[PDB]
UniProtKB/Swiss-Prot annotation, chain A:
Gene that encodes the chain: MCP
Protein name (record): Major capsid protein
Assembly and binders: Homomultimer. Makes the hexons and eleven out of twelve pentons. Interacts with triplex proteins 1/TRX1 and 2/TRX2; adjacent capsomers are linked together in groups of three by triplexes, heterotrimeric complexes composed of one molecule of TRX1 and two molecules of TRX2. Interacts with scaffold protein; this interaction allows efficient MCP transport to the host nucleus. Interacts with capsid vertex component 2/CVC2. Interacts with the small capsomere-interacting protein/SCP.
Family indicated by similarity: Belongs to the herpesviridae major capsid protein family.
Subcellular location: Virion; Host nucleus
UniProtKB/Swiss-Prot annotation, chains B, D, E:
Provenance organism: Human herpesvirus 6B (strain Z29) (HHV-6 variant B)
Name of protein: Large structural phosphoprotein
Subunit structure: Homotetramer. Interacts with the major capsid protein. 180 tegument protein pU11 tetramers bind to the virion capsid.
Location of this chain's protein in the cell: Virion tegument
Family statement drawn from the similarity comment of this UniProt entry: Belongs to the herpesviridae large structural phosphoprotein family.
Whole-protein residues included: 7 to 275 of 858
UniProt PTM comment: Phosphorylated at multiple sites.
UniProtKB/Swiss-Prot annotation, chain C:
Organism of this sequence: Human herpesvirus 6B (strain Z29)
Primary location: virion
Role description: Participates in the assembly of the infectious particles by decorating the outer surface of the capsid shell and thus forming a layer between the capsid and the tegument. Complexes composed of the major capsid protein and small capsomere-interacting protein/SCP assemble together in the host cytoplasm and are translocated to the nucleus, where they accumulate and participate in capsid assembly.
Keywords, comma-separated and alphabetical: Capsid protein, Host nucleus, Virion
Subcellular location: Virion; Host nucleus
GO biological process, one term: viral process
Whole-protein coverage range: 23 to 83 of 89
Protein name per Swiss-Prot or TrEMBL: Small capsomere-interacting protein
Length: 48, 269, 61, 269, 269
């Protein structure tokens, strides 16, 4: 499982007013999974 | 025409085939083929080695420098494409739209005159611009322009051109699908062609310096070994084979030693 | 003769597999391809996982 | 390298020469050159053609699409001149004077947008104004330009490009003797370059689509023939040659199928 | 080495002499020489002929089409003189003598309109009569250069071109009889060269269409005869000889049928 950043800017209609250099930062959990309940057997192999 | 009748005709054919297919076989360097130097070796043991190997390797390095200066390809054909890409693409990049790199165009011309370290600096300053255009926000990453598979292939092509500057291939970087633009591919072309051009020129200067160092070393050893005799044939061989050489006098010297080959093979004791 | 030693060395490096498992078809076919690798810096774990997934592909009843 | 099949060294050398001089010869189409396919067919009849020629024509279409993708020239270089001409001449004339064709300037702004097929539609309607300026009291004239032999040579060049997209030559229609005006010669330039660009892209996408369709068809027939066996080598050949192929995938798949040619020569009976 | 199915060396010499002197003999058409067709027959009567004369004629029509296609002369050298007359004489004559620049010569726009040339020539004959006698009504002579006996020689020359479009001649102009020198003799040369050009092109397309029609017909009959046998090399011959052909496939298919005449001589029963 990898972290990936996303450097993306806005739509152009919000890019206009001195938001040309803005850079929204999006972290996306590539190849990971959601988790809902405390994992006990596989504590060695699963990182929250 | 073609000295050393006194060697084996098989070995003379070996040297003829080597000097005929030097531009065809890979790793063009006389150091990298020691069986040429070991096929150069003189019969009847070390007693005749101790004199004739120096003359034999002397004519080997002379012919090697000669066939290099005769078979050097033209590099102005690839510098023509470098100048074309640098002029057209950079001027339409900057003067046509969003002119910021006026000083950088100043730089590209002033460095295109005669500087190579500055061509490495331009490789930096154009990788910056290619990362600006290919993914449209400025950030820095080292040495990678695009396309990891072709990046692995370009190292193979540069090793091929560095080993054989006589027989080189231009890669034609461009991509049929359009995942990065025309201008990004043009910067890819210019970076690859600049590295190729400086690779060919520096490998050429390396081979020419090695060849002249070997020729001067063989002159010193051969004159020091022919110093002993006071025969007229010996002193005439000294006064012929003692003269200094340049890169543009080696052809006349090869003609002179070919014309006076009989008196120096008689002068060999 | 050196190639057989490379094959056997890679076999012991993968898992320490016994020759009885070396005779298995999935091994018999892939040990020669694992010979033309692992001389590089690649990994030891990659070969274990590769053998896992290939042995799995083999056994689809 | 150059794995092909159980074919003769003669036939391998033939296919070597063909896929090397693909950009050299004209009318580049594997249907138009059937000698490649009967060089591809395997010795000793259909008892060993019935699987091996399926594999071998599969290898032909893979490496044919590979050498197309590796040797496509970049036609954006001619679309750059299309943008320069269409921008500088057309919009600025119709703005500087005769301020009625601004609807047609919105049309040529959408022509500047990458909708080439619909863009080159109504090149007649944007040629009629060039007819009006080349000859007074505007009439309808033939679509290719004013000089008769240049008009025929344009069509000859377009047929040459349509046969061989990989090797194309611009015509450079400009003349110092100018009975025809400067701006309408720029319009002639724009029409010729637009036709050249759309013709190259149509023929390229045509041959690319044909090659990919043939690759998928040979995969379907070859998997259907490999279906029956349940040995491990046969089902591994099924799972390798069953993998999906797109144009970005085909080059990595060619590397894969070399490293699997090491087995599937022996996996085939 | 021009491979033939089952022939005598006399018949091989006859067919090779026909394909060598195709451009030398008159009445260049394969249907006009029955002795070639009679020499194409195979020995041992109808039981051998019913299987093998189909393949023998299928050899001969392919080889005829190939040599005919290869030995096509350039038809642009005569159209260069047609444009030299049409551009320099008639346009400048109309601009000088105030004939308001009729574009009927430029209705061709290229050497593709083999239609309406007769109307162009009728307009040229009216212009020639009006130049020669100032106030003429249209009169019913085929050449308005005021010519009779060389008109008969011109009809003879056009018949000779119809017979041999591979090798052609251009006749002359003459001036013991001087009426209009640069003008109506250029009208004669333009009319004669137009009729010669359209005759060469129409007879060329006629022979090419006849040859390809006979090749497709022999494909159909020969594959219908060889459909029955289910043997290995027999259906290998079926898959070789089943391939469809056009005007440019035929060269490569001739190479195919040489390299498979290596086998399909024995493959035939």
């Amino acid at each position: 499982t990898k972290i990936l950043e996303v450097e993306v800017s806005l739509d152009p209609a919000q890019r206009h007013g001195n938001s040309v250099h803005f850079q929204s930062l999006q972290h996306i959990l590539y190849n990971g999974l959601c988790l809902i309940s405390p994992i006990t057997t596989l504590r060695r192999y699963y990182q929250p | 025409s073609i000295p050393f009748a006194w060697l084996d005709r098989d070995k003379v054919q070996r040297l003829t085939n080597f000097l005929s297919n030097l531009e065809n076989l890979e790793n063009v360097d006389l150091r990298e083929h020691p069986y040429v130097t070991n096929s150069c070796v003189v019969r009847e043991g070390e007693d005749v080695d101790e004199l004739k190997t120096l003359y034999n390797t002397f004519i080997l390095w002379l012919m090697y420098h000669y066939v290099l200066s005769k078979r050097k390809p033209d590099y102005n054909a690839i510098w023509q494409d470098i100048t074309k890409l640098q002029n057209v693409v950079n001027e339409y990049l900057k003067s046509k739209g969003l002119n910021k790199g006026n000083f950088e165009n100043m730089f590209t011309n002033k460095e295109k005159f005669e500087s190579q370290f500055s061509d490495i600096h331009r490789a930096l300053l154009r990788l910056g611009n290619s990362i600006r255009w290919g993914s449209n926000v400025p950030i820095d990453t080292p040495y990678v322009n695009l396309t990891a598979e072709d990046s692995s292939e370009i190292e193979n092509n540069l090793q091929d051109a560095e080993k054989n500057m006589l027989w080189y291939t231009v890669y034609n970087i461009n991509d049929p699908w359009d995942e990065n633009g025309y201008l990004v591919t043009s910067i890819n072309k210019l970076v690859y062609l600049g590295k190729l051009f400086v690779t060919l020129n520096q490998s050429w200067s390396k081979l020419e310096k090695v060849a002249m160092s070997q020729i001067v070393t063989t002159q010193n050893h051969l004159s020091g070994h022919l110093r002993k005799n006071e025969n007229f044939n010996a002193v005439y061989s000294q006064r012929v084979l003692q003269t200094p050489l340049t890169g543009q006098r080696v052809e006349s010297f090869l003609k002179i030693i070919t014309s006076d080959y009989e008196i120096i093979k008689s002068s060999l004791e | 003769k050196e190639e057989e030693k490379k094959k056997q060395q890679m076999l012991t490096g993968v898992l320490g597999l016994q020759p009885t498992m070396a005779n298995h078809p999935v091994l018999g076919v892939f040990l020669p391809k694992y010979a033309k690798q692992n001389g590089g810096n690649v990994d030891k774990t990659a070969f274990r996982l590769d053998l896992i997934r290939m042995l799995a592909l083999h056994r689809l009843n």
